[PDB]
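Re: guanosine-5'-triphosphate structure - here you go.
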Amino acid sequence: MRECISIHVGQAGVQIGNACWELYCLEHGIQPDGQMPSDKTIGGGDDSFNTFFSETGAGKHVPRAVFVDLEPTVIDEVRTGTYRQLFHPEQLITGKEDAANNYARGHYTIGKEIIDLVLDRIRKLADQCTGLQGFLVFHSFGGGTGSGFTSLLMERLSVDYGKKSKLEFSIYPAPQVSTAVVEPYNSILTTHTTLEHSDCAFMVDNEAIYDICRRNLDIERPTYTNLNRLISQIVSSITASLRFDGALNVDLTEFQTNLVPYPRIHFPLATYAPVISAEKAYHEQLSVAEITNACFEPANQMVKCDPRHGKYMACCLLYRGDVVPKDVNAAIATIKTKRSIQFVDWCPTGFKVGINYQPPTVVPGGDLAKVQRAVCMLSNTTAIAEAWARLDHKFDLMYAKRAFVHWYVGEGMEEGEFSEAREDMAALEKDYEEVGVDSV
Amino acid sequence: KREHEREVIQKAIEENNNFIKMAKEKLAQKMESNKENREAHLAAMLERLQEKDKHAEEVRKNKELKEEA
Amino acid sequence: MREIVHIQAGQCGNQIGAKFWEVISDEHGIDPTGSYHGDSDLQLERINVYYNEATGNKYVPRAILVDLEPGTMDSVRSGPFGQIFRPDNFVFGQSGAGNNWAKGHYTEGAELVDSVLDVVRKESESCDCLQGFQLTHSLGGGTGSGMGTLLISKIREEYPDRIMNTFSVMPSPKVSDTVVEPYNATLSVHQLVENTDETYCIDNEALYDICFRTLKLTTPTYGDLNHLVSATMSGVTTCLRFPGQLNADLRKLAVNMVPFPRLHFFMPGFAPLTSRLTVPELTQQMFDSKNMMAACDPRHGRYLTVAAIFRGRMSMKEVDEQMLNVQNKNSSYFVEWIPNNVKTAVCDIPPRGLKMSATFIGNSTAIQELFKRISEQFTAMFRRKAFLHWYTGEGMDEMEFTEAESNMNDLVSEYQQYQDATAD
Ligand SMILES: CC[C@H](C)[C@@H]([C@@H](CC(=O)N1CCC[C@H]1[C@H](OC)[C@@H](C)C(=O)N[C@H](C)[C@@H](O)c1ccccc1)OC)N(C)C(=O)[C@@H](NC(=O)[C@@H](NC)C(C)C)C(C)C
Ligand SMILES: Nc1nc2c(ncn2[C@@H]2O[C@H](COP(=O)(O)OP(=O)(O)OP(=O)(O)O)[C@@H](O)[C@H]2O)c(=O)[nH]1
Ligand SMILES: Nc1nc2c(ncn2[C@@H]2O[C@H](COP(=O)(O)OP(=O)(O)O)[C@@H](O)[C@H]2O)c(=O)[nH]1
Ligand SMILES: [Ca+2]
Ligand SMILES: [Mg+2]
Ligand SMILES: [Mg+2]
């Protein structure tokens, strides 16, 4: 019951999936061959970790996950890597030719050749569930597959599963690690196409993560491996309420109720603490009060933007580890005194809090210190729209000269789809302005 | 009150079904339009290349005509 | 898994072609007999992009050698790496093209083109997933320029969805005194603007100037020029041949480099340029006009797009800092309406004989200087209708010359239009 199916799309989605599933295995005590000695029910069960793992008669715990990419070389590393036994081969799906950083190839020319096979494999996972809750979809904004195939997939999932919930983890581009000049086009196209199909989307700004790795972990030039280990901790924080239970645990769906006041306003800002190196964490106790305060420091946000220049519509705190109610209540009291957190006039101001007692885990060879307690704040702030404005501006610069547009038109797209997508983004920015205005 | 309860749940079903229906139709429209556009772009490209072939035939025809004179 | 088919045509095409295969064979640890004897797995990771595997673990270049006379190809065959090529992939006539584009394109070349296509199909059929074609050729002669462009058209007809890439050697009076060269080049450029996706402009003018002025070679040989060419071709194909993130295949390169379909002519550059370095120095030099393989000053135009490739063991932090520095300090020379238009790749494997090197690929509107130089030479002959009988005698019409000139001048106009454009 309450199963969640994860779908990892394109290089970024797949590589982040690697990092997340490895971390989940460590958190639950699952070996790379999928055995879990602590699990006494063989071949099934309804424990909390079963929302994310099915089981075979032979004791294997198998991710409820599909990996899909339009070329094989990234998923091939999964197929031959450390966790190769973890996945059934049919969960790992590849084509031969990728989308070449072109939304149109991912959604149409190339994506159309594999979409039916992908849905068939998702259906096999869905059939195993006794109460499927929804999907978690991981993908880049910038890549041709991450943008175009994800959009196609989300549209097809709405048809095949109706309003079954679909959440996204979406990688927002940064120039330090970007690989295509047309990423703003792909970003706007996929955000427009997916908007009415997604219930909640957590944007992960690669520049924010890049900065945190440089500044907090003293990593000179972060790699995708550095970025993805940090990202996976944030994803783990957010999915922890689904995978563990405890008296103080609050389900992700309850946070979602508070976080989404209108269907289109569904992009929470995540902020995570503590991000600290072993060297600096040694002989340093980071209290509940300290990690909570860090949630309101924009340096720790997953998306670059300034909530102090915006208004809040909701604030959720997701704690894990050695965290007791009295300390959380005292920390929030302090914050409400010292920080001006301004809410819109039509929302209550109380923070919604969940606590999971299982402490954070780290993967061997990482740069993150292992800590006794951590927190992820999820906030609904008008400031998140800053991220749209930056992308929309880059789109506008190129589109005004129709730069690169012929690559899309040559694959069957029309200029009307570009302008329609950009107009939807203009309307989204206007929606975020409007919810911030005081009531009459 | 019971009639109202029935109406509310049938409304929920109808709106879910209509969402699926319109998603389904939008997608079929988009895919057909894309297919036709891409095929037309390829057709035009081939058409131009085939005109080059014809032109080349004329060039050789022209050379042959010049030759005996 | 993503194969490239290589075609080399005419004297120049086969000369630089052979050198390219010698150079990357060494980089991938392939010996002249096709046997692998290398030290690192990174050498074999993407070997199938350029080589077929045969029995007994032999690697054979996916290469087709084309000419209308047999001399150069005989030279290649009894070369160092002559035996590495597939014998059936040598396709040659006997009568030559006499430095006549019309012979290459309409007459002699047209008689040989079908047997070349037979070899192309054989190589393409056995591909797991063909990405496209790369052609080496000169624009000044008759076979490479005329038959080379004919092959492009024919291949495009049967593979219209694949990428077509050329390494095109531009003629210069300094290197050769053949009078008809601007005709052959202008007729060629007319074909390339319509039918290739990306063309590297290898300018003999620039090659001669580097050899004479920089390398201080009093009398540069063709061998000297080709040394630059092979270094360059190695550099710009590094991201295709070794594992990597950026511009890792022909189509992703094109999507990053070509904002408008006709503007697909690149100015390559290489550092260091030496004959008998810090990251800041590498970076300075690769953006330096003295290091460009096309005879154009980038400070006389603006960059639409740039790809930079660094090779060797170096600090990626430093490379990132220096690339940001170059763009910031020279912001006027990058079009503001294409954000983030400079992409950088680093490959750990240096080229033979260097600790580190840098290769530059620019789509700069200053490339119009190259086309203007040709156009000037062209029009000087064509205004007085000089030497046209060579071409009309093969059946060509004057109007085709006019159209070719017209198209090339249009290409120049378009570079200027985008050089002049502003964001606001
Ligand atoms: C500047 C134009 C080319 C570059 C030079 C060069 C030709 C060359 O290198 N030639 C003519 C094929 C033989 C080759 C060289 O000969 C010494 C060998 C060693 C070679 O470079 N071999 C290389 C490794 C080989 O791959 C190869 C490449 C191309 C062709 C043949 C062989 O010789 C100085 N030439 C014609 C010249 O310098 C001649 N200059 C002129 O003709 C001038 N007008 C009088 C202009 C056109 C340059 C002088 C000899 C009078
Ligand atoms: N955080 C993170 N970002 C990544 C990773 N891989 C790629 N990206 C980002 O994703 C964008 C590029 O899209 P990719 O996911 O590589 O492309 P793809 O989905 O495989 O699509 P095609 O290759 O075009 O078929 C750029 O913004 C990259 O910085 C990763 O492992 N982690
Ligand atoms: N860089 C370089 N240029 C060459 C070489 N051989 C010929 N060329 C140039 O190519 C043009 C002549 O074309 P060529 O290839 O000799 O004629 P083809 O055999 O009919 O293609 C002239 O501008 C020459 O300067 C070479 O080995 N290297
Ligand atoms: Ca069990
Ligand atoms: Mg990819
Ligand atoms: Mg010659």
